[PDB]
Amino acid sequence: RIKLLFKEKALEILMTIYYESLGGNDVYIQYIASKVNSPHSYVWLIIKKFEEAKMVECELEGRTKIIRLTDKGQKIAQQIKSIIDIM
Prior knowledge:
Helix content is about 65%, strand content about 15%. A three-stranded antiparallel β-sheet has the order 1-3-2. The PDB classes it as structural genomics, unknown function. The entry lists the keywords AF1382, Archaeoglobus fulgidus, PSI, structural genomics, southeast collaboratory for structural genomics, Protein Structure Initiative, secsg, unknown function.
């Protein structure tokens, strides 16, 4: 039913960032990869699309890519959470 309406891979990435940040973790690209069913390169591509859409920001801490939701990204994730709940 989720696949009905959503691009499942992009959704899983977004909600992973949401829940990880909500719990108080810095969100690392490596961690998102451990949680979703996508190769590192695909996660990277989707993150760049989210960044383009102004939903996330990226920064490098040494060799470590950290991803944070913008206010826009957060709002969207919260609304998707309610849809998933309703579904």
